[PDB]
Amino acid sequence: SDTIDLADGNYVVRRGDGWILSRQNQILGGSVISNGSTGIVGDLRVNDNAIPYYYPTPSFNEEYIKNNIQTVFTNFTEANQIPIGFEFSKTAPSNKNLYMYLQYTYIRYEIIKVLQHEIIERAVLYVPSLGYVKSIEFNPGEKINKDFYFLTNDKCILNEQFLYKKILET
Amino acid sequence: SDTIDLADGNYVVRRGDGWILSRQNQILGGSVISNGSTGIVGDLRVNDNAIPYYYPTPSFNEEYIKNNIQTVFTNFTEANQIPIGFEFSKTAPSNKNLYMYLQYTYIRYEIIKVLQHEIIERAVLYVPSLGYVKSIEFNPGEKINKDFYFLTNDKCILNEQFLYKKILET
Amino acid sequence: SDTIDLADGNYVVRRGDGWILSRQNQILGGSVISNGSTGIVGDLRVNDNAIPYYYPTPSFNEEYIKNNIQTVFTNFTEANQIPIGFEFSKTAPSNKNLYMYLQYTYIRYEIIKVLQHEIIERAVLYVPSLGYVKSIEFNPGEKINKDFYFLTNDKCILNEQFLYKKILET
Amino acid sequence: TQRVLPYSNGLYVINKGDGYIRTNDKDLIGTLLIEAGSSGSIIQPRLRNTTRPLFTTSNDTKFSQQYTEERLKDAFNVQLFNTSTSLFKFVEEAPSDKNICIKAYNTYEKYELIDYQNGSIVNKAEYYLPSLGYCEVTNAPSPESEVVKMQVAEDGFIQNGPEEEIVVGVIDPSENIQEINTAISDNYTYNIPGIVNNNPFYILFTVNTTGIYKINAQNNLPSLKIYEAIGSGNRNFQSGNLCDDDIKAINYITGFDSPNAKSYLVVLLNKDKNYYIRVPQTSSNIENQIQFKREEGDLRNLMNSSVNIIDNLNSTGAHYYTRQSPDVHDYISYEFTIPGNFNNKDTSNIRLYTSYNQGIGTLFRVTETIDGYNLINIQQNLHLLNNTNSIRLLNGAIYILKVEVTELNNYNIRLHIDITN
Amino acid sequence: TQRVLPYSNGLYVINKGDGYIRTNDKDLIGTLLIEAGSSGSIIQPRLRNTTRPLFTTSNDTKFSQQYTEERLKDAFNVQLFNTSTSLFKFVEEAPSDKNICIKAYNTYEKYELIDYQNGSIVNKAEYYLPSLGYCEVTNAPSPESEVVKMQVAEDGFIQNGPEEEIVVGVIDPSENIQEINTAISDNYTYNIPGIVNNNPFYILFTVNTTGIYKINAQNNLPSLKIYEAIGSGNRNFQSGNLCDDDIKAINYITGFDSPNAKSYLVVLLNKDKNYYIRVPQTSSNIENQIQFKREEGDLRNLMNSSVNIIDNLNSTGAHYYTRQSPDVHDYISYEFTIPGNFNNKDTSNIRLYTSYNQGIGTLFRVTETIDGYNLINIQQNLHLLNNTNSIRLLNGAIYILKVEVTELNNYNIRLHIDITN
Amino acid sequence: TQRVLPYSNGLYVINKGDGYIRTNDKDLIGTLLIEAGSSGSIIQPRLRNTTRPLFTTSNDTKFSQQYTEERLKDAFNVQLFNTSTSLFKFVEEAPSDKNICIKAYNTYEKYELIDYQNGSIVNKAEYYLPSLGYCEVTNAPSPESEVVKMQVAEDGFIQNGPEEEIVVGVIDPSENIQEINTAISDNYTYNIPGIVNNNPFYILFTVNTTGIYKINAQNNLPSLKIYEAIGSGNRNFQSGNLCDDDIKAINYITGFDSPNAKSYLVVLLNKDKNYYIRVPQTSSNIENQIQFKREEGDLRNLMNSSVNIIDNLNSTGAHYYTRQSPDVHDYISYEFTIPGNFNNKDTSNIRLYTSYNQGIGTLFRVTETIDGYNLINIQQNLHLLNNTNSIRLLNGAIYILKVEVTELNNYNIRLHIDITN
Ligand SMILES: [Cl-]
Ligand SMILES: [Cl-]
Ligand SMILES: [Cl-]
């Protein structure tokens, strides 16, 4: 369930890179390439696409989350001011059409409260990382799985992680 | 001749992409690459190399041309404010020299007046599109055809087109 | 020794491109690439990394050096205002690690005073040119030669040159 | 030959696909003629971030461009409409044999915003969000064929991307969202507050333990609807409490739009999800409450559907009841009482059938004990569409017909309960 | 051993090729030493648009840099001299075996601007327009050979691009351009306006129907020249009207520079082209007109050339006439009258020959009817150079010798008409 | 089990390698999941030039960040600490079979700044200069294994680059640098100026002709040290003159730190190099001079070492002398006089040995002629470490023991001269 072999108290948790968010999949748009050509989509992580997503709880407000995350793990406020680019390249096979679309990935951080081997409270922070492309080869009028276009719940495209540190009192 | 199976009146005509202009061929310069190396020339279509070329007539002044062209076909004034780049890559064969030179291409638009299956008046607009490179392998002192360097009359490097719409009166 | 088959007087000397300077080798940093990936390091020669290195003598002060060099050979003050980039690409072999590091190269100019077939005075100017990468494949804990990391005396990675012109009196 | 849209009343945003271009080359970036052996690139480097979205609407005053953008943000979380930092680039190497052409077009992702009401679209907007291009490669044109004149096409679009229809319901912004800050356990009674009188509104709630719940208003009036907030409960979490993530993207689960229809809801709720209840415009000044009850018994057999309470069944003959038809594989249920005195002997002949939609039905006898409601399955696999089969039931007894729609031929479902004797 | 330049008087711009670099590494961008397997790039990304053109002139006061640039714009339509948005980039992958060096140089396209007058260049400018680079790759230098000292080369250039000589005449800007706004049909008479008195000027005109035209001034004085505007008539078009595209790039067709030389022009004109006529400095205050006439008859045999009217042939003996020689394969014609009374019997021995240039000649007898001029071909394939062959012609009769230059040994052509009896 | 650091007193900057990253993903740029066939790039385009160096110190007041940066500039000529124009980019093409992940990290080059004094580090700073990245590629993760919880590592670094230890001595900036502007020939006497009284200082000098030089203060007090400036004499040059290139990067050649130790230096100097002499803090107000003398004779056998003058050898028995041990393969020499009257017959038994360090020794008899000093080699290949072999030498005679350290077990070398009879 939400059971965890840890002592009572608060924790910062790095849950890994490679998280993609629900519903948000196609909002950057995509390319259609054809017949031997190569498509290359990319982005640049600066300023107003590097603004993170906070999800606080009664115990853990935003400031608390930011401060603990940046103390233990990476300081995203300093890092995300310096532009970093990324790109993906796909090649269309002869006499076929390829569609490729781009979405941001995030590092998922958590603040958890544990009481009697149980997580009774959890705050979440998504910090923009890089990106991820999905591609499909298609025919005119071919029906495509909804799952290719639309993500219902947040998932991690890599292996999830659980890197914790206990938070001590002021 | 200038005979056309259309009714009497005025027309906007998109004559296609891929037009190159007379005399203008080498004015951007060119590269000399040698012995296995790769040359890559390119440009960036913004502002003052995207300014179009007008050729009006007594009936069809510049404003008329611009307005009708932008109503029916692409609005070049809005488009040519947003930078678009293009590149070409050539590779020199071992122990030989290659020369490559760049020139702009244009979409050719026309305003025609037709009277009794005959074009009696024609205004022309060239809107900057992308570019085109010509290359040749050469020896020291080898005579090269003038035709490689110098275009005497405007031509289309692609198949010409004739996409028309009749213009109705104010 | 410092013997030269020239007449008495002063000379400007272009000693070639491809000079690297002592101690300075690793100050731009380097990349570690692994397992099939490709690393690409590069730079951009403008403004404050294109500022040249002067080494004047009692006869030949800086202004003298600059003026004679720029009169006879390339005018570096005008040239080094216009950005020029360069890049190097290395590929790591499967299941091995590669380290690549970057350093600037320079054109070496000299002002020499010759008296009785002997160079009795020499001023030196290093003008920033492009760059140069050294790479090595390594194992964890493998000892690497100091010579790979650290240059004790200025050398030329190409063939040295001696392109001279006699300087005539004001 | 129009498809029946069995959507519930309200707002939907529909992703209709990527790679849309306009007619008559209005979105042509241009063409490169690449000689054999060589390569060519067309690049969008985003040196300027400006983009040019296209928008049309049927109603400037409700579905303005602003409103429509807000709806796209609610549905898919789009937030850059005028701008883009996303690069795209097309590269082509021509084969050794022949020359090659590449045409590059700008593209759009097409979104449609509808207001769907009682079986038709009453408001419609199309928003074309700037996308990441279309690149067709062709063989080099040959000299010269001959140029054949052609008239311009009508204004419109052409899709070059793959087929796509993604439908996402959105919370109507003109209606209030009240919250039940405590997670619901076995029972809960929500008093309807005066801050939201008369106007329809939503109630955002969550559940403590995954299970089937009966939800209704006092005397089963008015009829309620229930939605699931899409992708909720994936993030922040407080035990036994609601965590509102401001998610306005909603999946319709069940419920009628006709507010004068007596009904109750029976739905499977997850503890790791949030749900919205929509209570409609009520034309009465009387106080009302929303009752939530966890079902541990036979009522669990009715998930997920609304149950119509049929009251007017007090004579013999023909009785018919029209509701919005559920979609294929979805459910609708009717609770009725066979007319007459219950004396455990007197019986009537009952014929249940539909008029246009095909549905599989299962019939339950309902008796209430001191342990709750009991449901005895007395008839299975009833094929309702123009059914001629009849069954004898007890006068004065109470039955529930559960109907699964299998063939959706009509926007409405018409149930007939014909009684003879 | 100098080439004869049979150019007409006036201004020429000459593209002398691309890939020019200066001596002593003045344009070296630099060298990359690429280890085997690896790759190296040198890039001109145009982060700054500034470029540095090189200019030299013989006459700062006429051919200034401004003037020269304007001339390059007239000839080839160059318009960015100080700037460039054009990227270039050199990439090299070293083979698996050995290391590789690449040297990158900036380059120039060399333009020469000449004022050519009566057989020599009287004003000269060289404009080096910044180009798109030169990339030589070489094998890695070996340790150490030995460094051999070398003196610097003289200042100058080296061409690394392919051989090129493109010669383009340009309209002299100090001279007015008058226009004939109506397309010429069969006949036209242009009165010479007082707005352009004494000074030389151009007349821009077009033709309604492709055909051969005789053009001349009153009494064939002064001599005119005719140019075609390069690439004209490809664009805007109004039936029966001149459309001026402001094209200053001109191809010389025919005409003499000596203004005291009686002559007329016979030229093939296209309806889809514009033409300039240059009328020279006239030292007279008398009115004059330019006559245009469409030729449907035998005069069509004289295209394209100027015809010298020879007047002073009124005695027996040696007569000689010097003109600017046409280029190889171009024409020049002479109309003369055999001295004596025309009585249809009296005859003279005529010897026609050239002194240095070899030319093939055809002889015509000219009679004028009420239907126009008639040309009877009486002699073909005359090899003029030091010709000793003679022919007997009728006293008082009129002949035209058409001469095609086949070997250009002299800037001038010297025709001799020796008459005996 | 600590290594003995046989460094001379003073400041050192040590390049400890490239590719350092912090623990707990603090420097992760991010991960790309590349599907098979495709490629992925991570790019540092330097659109902003800002970088973020990391610095720690043991002493904020001497080794501040400013000071430490100045030291790095002295040692390796680093000059951009906050900024960088250097691009790096990682590219990966996934093989046709399987998917691929690439993780990109920012990296640092680690520099250590030490103040080393009498056998231990007394001040220490670590400066992490921003570098050009680390790129690890891995196979695609499989669903799902299972996520195993792990505590965070301690704060610190991990080196991903190759092993590196580059040690570079630097001029102490708190001490003056005097100059001898004339190149030294055979002899030179430098008077010690009052501008630098009491405090230690450096003397920068060069030599006219490559050769071995004896350098010392008056009466061999105080002891001097000598350094070579790294990479000097490669550039500007004036015959017979010093050219100061402001090089503060120094290699220790030889010399003692104990200033009360009588000694002189014998060193091989190059004409194409500059050298620094360090003269220590002298507790006397008496004038002093540094004597330079070119050695053409047998003293050339003592290069490169310091020679201790041993004075207190005037009784029989046990005598011992402690100095800083040279590194392996480096030299130290002792000049002593066998106690007693020199009458060319009386003799004593001498035992020379070390206590912990192993050294190969060669013994010289020293006689001074009118031609200079003469060195007769009377004993070779002496293994000093706990040597039991003894040799009979002449009372009143003068000897020099030259010692090459071969096994460095102790920071100090302890020489014993045991005398019996
Ligand atoms: Cl029905
Ligand atoms: Cl001749
Ligand atoms: Cl010892």
Numbering used by the authors:
A (entry chain A), B (entry chain A), C (entry chain A): 20 to 189
D (entry chain B), E (entry chain B), F (entry chain B): 206 to 626
Authors' own words:
Here, we report the complete structure of a bimodular ∼760 kDa BoNT/A large progenitor toxin complex (L-PTC), which is composed of BoNT and four non-toxic bacterial proteins. We found that L-PTC/A consists of two structurally and functionally independent sub-complexes, the M-PTC and the HA complex. The HA complex is composed of HA70, HA17, and HA33 in a 3∶3∶6 stoichiometry and adopts an extended three-blade architecture, whereas the M-PTC is situated on top of the HA complex platform. BoNT/A absorption is mainly mediated by nine glycan-binding sites on the HA complex that together form multivalent interactions with host carbohydrate receptors on intestinal epithelial cells.
We next separated the HA complex into two major components: the central hub composed of homo-trimeric HA70 and the blade composed of HA70D3–HA17–HA33. Their crystal structures were determined at 2.9 Å and 3.7 Å, respectively. HA70 consists of three domains (D1–3). The D1 and D2 domains, which adopt similar structures, mediate the trimerization of HA70 with each protomer contributing ∼3,100 Å2 of solvent-accessible area for interactions. The D3 domain, sitting at the tip of the trimer, is composed of two similar jelly-roll-like β-sandwich structures. The linker between D1 and D2 (residues Thr190–Ser205) is degraded and not visible in the crystal structure, which is reminiscent of the post-translational nicking of HA70 into ∼25 and ∼45 kDa fragments that occurs physiologically. Gly399 and Ile400 of HA70 are located in a loop that has weak electron density in the crystal structures, suggesting high flexibility. The corresponding interface residues in the HA complex are located around the center of the HA70 trimer.
